[PDB]
Design a protein around this ligand. Structure first.
Ligand SMILES: N[C@@H](CCCC[NH3+])C(=O)O
Ligand SMILES: N[C@@H](CCCC[NH3+])C(=O)O
Ligand SMILES: C[C@@H](O)[C@H](N)C(=O)O
Ligand SMILES: C[C@@H](O)[C@H](N)C(=O)O
Ligand SMILES: C[C@@H](O)[C@H](N)C(=O)O
Ligand SMILES: C[C@@H](O)[C@H](N)C(=O)O
Lengths: 367, 150, 370, 157
């Protein structure tokens, strides 16, 4: 077949891990596949390069930042290349599908600078690759975090949107962007470990094409990395919402989730990384003084726990089971977010582990 | 970091809001058990934070609406009100990786400000920005997003 | 007023030092000069890259080594460019893949240009662009009259000729890479060895010692090498092609030949000695000892406790007394001269490595290089 | 980096044979030349056996006869004999960075044997390969090196 592979920085930490990876590359070639590899920079290099750039120049020009991160990845490209060559195979380094295809036809393993994930999925899209393998330190996408849920087990199959949903609400396994391209075209992914014979988790179906039976509850995700900010007493007028998020956008505050429901005024709650929280509060407190909102609140002990599954789309039961599960372990639902295929609640971080267990137990994940 | 692939509209749902649910373990459950046992398949669910009481709103097919009310009405004795809307409309911007590009969410809002359409409800994630508006504002709402984002 | 500046890895080992280099670059421009800059990789990055290469694929391809070491250099170039830009100057980066042409174009726009070895690239550029100086920055503020650890009252040289610098580098000094100084000599490109950690003007490597007037011609430095082994091949027949057998066989084994010496024939045979890195001494002896069989030579000696001490200076070219003083200095401390070799402006001698420090000390004071 | 090839027929060569390999002995030779104002250039001392060695040096041809007379008036010191050659030629390959490229030195010696010129003395370094031959053999030696190293430039010297 034709298989594209992405290796993250962990997998490429040291010469030793670089050989482990080169052994996998060549094994894949030797089984009779065309093989194209996308490499990240070596363990933490990229964000070491982001630190340095920022110390050298607080607002680094994107034109010099492209050189910095490209160069850090090039050392990963060469080192993997030299390693594959040490094991007998031939390598061709690239820093479009039409010229890769030639090298492919010559039988060389093509190594292309990365984001890496999007580079890989794109390349798999353009070449009509049979699969795109993502190699990190995780051997799959589990039904829950096993460090938290003893009965968490490895999925073997998962739809495109199911994964996106998990990727959106906890799972840091793939960059969402790369998965959207995955689904945009019909590019199967699979999550595998650099140090295992295990097939890993196939992310392959569009959930619409899923046979009902296989449309089940998929998994439970956890996120304790976010703060909740709440703005009170916002007049219910066009452009008032634009007032808050234009302010936050200007100060580069990452927004994950915003919720608004309904004195002729409403409230807007949103979620941001904890390190953004403080500057989010500093910004919004200013605007409060000027004839706008009545108060703005801060909370950095929030936790998000979610259930995602194509099976909840057409099944009247799941919300009430979600609810009943948290009730029976005495955790209080503070906020409720949803999509067609996911339920997400905000609670205290200290209740997150207990909640993940309860949902996971209630819905028969883990057999 | 991010990508924006399209916009969606929908005028097949109704909105029901249960006001004044006491913020306590198990109370959300009471509203959804009833509905679930009557086989009303629900979609959006929304609650903010708060008498120290709060409110939950959910959407369901309009075909099931009046009947969803009946089940909530005849079993209202622990909530103060339950409203029915049935003229609501949902517009979603679809994409992936929007958390690192907060400008997108700002622009979504500003796009509806400039066509003068009021946002009644909002629920977003890294992959989807959804708002409920008046069903009659849909075509404008949708149009405006296309111009903003292209 | 054009000035090429090469910054070593020590000059760019951290963000702080990079910013501090950008200011020096931007200050050099504000002083009315057009500036082109060449950067090594940060600190000990190249060595680290080389170690990682050698772990992954011994004898690795050159088109993967070129890609690996260019990337290390690219990190610095990007960071220095960002730094310069925070100081309000314009920078356009380059790869060799460019020329005088596209550089000189950017220079005329008043852009600081950051552009297959680093020392050689900098001197190459200065040459092509016809620069007034090529400055080599590092953590050493000049070239000295001797190794300061060994000779304690060794002084920084104000100025030095191309060949004097070339000659010192050939027998111990490791400040500039040799081929870059040779490039400077041929294209007549003045070099400045100076510190990026201070304001000291460093040392000028400028003229040809050909054009130093006999009266200004002086003694420049004392240099030391304790990294060589001495191999001697006895009973080589005095006939054409016999020398070739020795060196083809050493070259085919990639043995680095420094200094080779053969003195006049005096049986119908001569002898040949040569120094090599002590790492190579073992392979060199194996190759040579198994060709001793087959009659090519009567014996082959090995000695890895040999030190080399040299005196260089255009001064000795026209002046009869210097070899005499040199030999006399060593005799008066009690060191025996085992081997002697020369160039027009350099005396080199092999002695016991144990006698080496004291030999340099003796030479240094006898010629009052302090 | 190979810059050029230089020739020279301006020098005499003189050798002291059987100098005792003992501190001070080289000094005696060169002091005497220095005192007689003889400006030397090349100097070579390599092998010992007798435990004695030889020292050869070069100096301008006009000083050769004086140089050998000074040394002969100091023989038996220790020495077997002093030699004087007024027909020595010197060819040099000039360049840089030759240690890490031992091919160059090998190609130097191959060039001269393929032209059947015998190499009488050798003295090299990282930036120069020099031999002494019959001045007789200069043309052939030079030509041979120009062709071997793709140079044709004498600019080196
Ligand atoms: N179909 C599910 C909806 C779960 C909420 C997510 N849309 C139910 O009736 O409970
Ligand atoms: N001509 C000087 C230098 C010695 C030889 C070095 N090439 C002298 O007589 O001592
Ligand atoms: C969600 C709300 O109803 C309440 N906090 C509960 O847990 O049931
Ligand atoms: C955000 C919402 O409360 C407001 N009505 C708006 O449309 O901007
Ligand atoms: C001894 C060696 O130099 C010999 N004369 C040759 O030319 O090969
Ligand atoms: C020069 C050499 O022949 C002698 N051993 C000396 O040191 O004088």
């Amino acid at each position: 077949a034709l298989v594209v592979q992405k290796y993250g920085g962990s997998s490429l930490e040291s010469a030793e891990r670089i050989r482990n990876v080169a052994e996998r590359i060549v094994a894949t070639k030797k089984a009779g596949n065309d093989v194209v590899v996308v490499c990240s920079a070596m363990g933490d290099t990229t964000d070491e390069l982001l630190e340095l750039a920022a110390a050298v120049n607080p607002v680094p020009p994107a034109r010099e930042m492209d050189m910095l991160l490209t160069a850090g990845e090039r050392i990963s490209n060469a080192l993997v290349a030299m390693a594959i060559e040490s094991l007998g195979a031939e390598a061709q380094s690239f820093t479009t599908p039409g010229r890769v295809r030639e090298a492919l036809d010559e039988g060389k393993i093509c190594i292309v600078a990365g984001g890496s994930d999007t580079t890989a999925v794109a390349l798999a899209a353009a070449l009509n690759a049979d699969v795109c393998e993502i190699y990190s330190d995780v051997d799959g996408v589990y039904t829950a975090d096993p460090r938290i849920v003893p009965n968490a087990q490895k999925l073997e199959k998962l739809s495109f949107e199911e994964m996106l949903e998990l990727a959106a609400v906890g799972s840091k396994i793939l960059v969402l962007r790369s998965v959207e391209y995955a689904r945009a075209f019909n590019v199967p992914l699979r999550v595998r470990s650099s140090y295992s014979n295990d097939p890993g988790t196939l992310i392959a179906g569009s959930m619409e094409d899923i046979p009902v039976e296989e449309a089940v509850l998929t998994g439970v995700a956890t996120d304790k990395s976010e703060a909740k900010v709440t703005v009170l007493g916002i007049s219910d007028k066009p452009g008032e919402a634009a007032k808050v998020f234009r302010a936050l956008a200007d100060a580069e505050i990452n927004i994950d989730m915003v919720l608004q429901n309904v004195d002729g005024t409403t409230d807007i709650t949103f979620t941001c990384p904890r390190s953004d929280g403080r500057r989010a509060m500093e910004i919004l407190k200013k605007l409060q003084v000027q004839g706008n909102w009545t108060n703005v609140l801060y909370d950095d002990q929030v936790g998000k726990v979610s259930l995602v599954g194509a099976g909840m789309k057409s099944h009247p039961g799941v919300t009430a089971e979600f609810m009943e599960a948290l009730r029976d372990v005495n955790v209080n639902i503070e906020l409720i977010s949803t999509s067609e295929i996911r339920i997400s609640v905000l609670i205290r971080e200290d209740d997150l582990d207990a909640a993940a267990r309860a949902l996971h137990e209630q819905f028969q994940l883990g057999g | 970091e991010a990508v924006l692939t399209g916009v969606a509209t929908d005028k097949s749902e109704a909105k029901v809001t249960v006001l004044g649910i006491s913020d306590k373990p198990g109370e959300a459950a009471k509203v959804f058990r009833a509905l679930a046992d009557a086989e009303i398949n629900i979609d959006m669910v929304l609650q903010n934070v708060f008498d120290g009481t709060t409110d939950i709103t959910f959407t369901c097919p309009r075909s099931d609406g009046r009947r969803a009310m009946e089940i909530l009405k005849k079993l209202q004795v622990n909530w103060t009100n339950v409203l029915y809307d049935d003229q609501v409309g949902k517009v979603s911007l679809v994409g992936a990786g929007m958390k690192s590009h907060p400008g997108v969410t700002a622009e979504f809002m500003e796009a509806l400000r400039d066509v003068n359409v009021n946002i009644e409800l909002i629920s977003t994630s890294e992959i989807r920005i959804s708002v409920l508006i008046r069903e009659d504002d849909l075509d404008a709402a949708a149009r405006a997003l296309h111009e903003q984002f292209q």
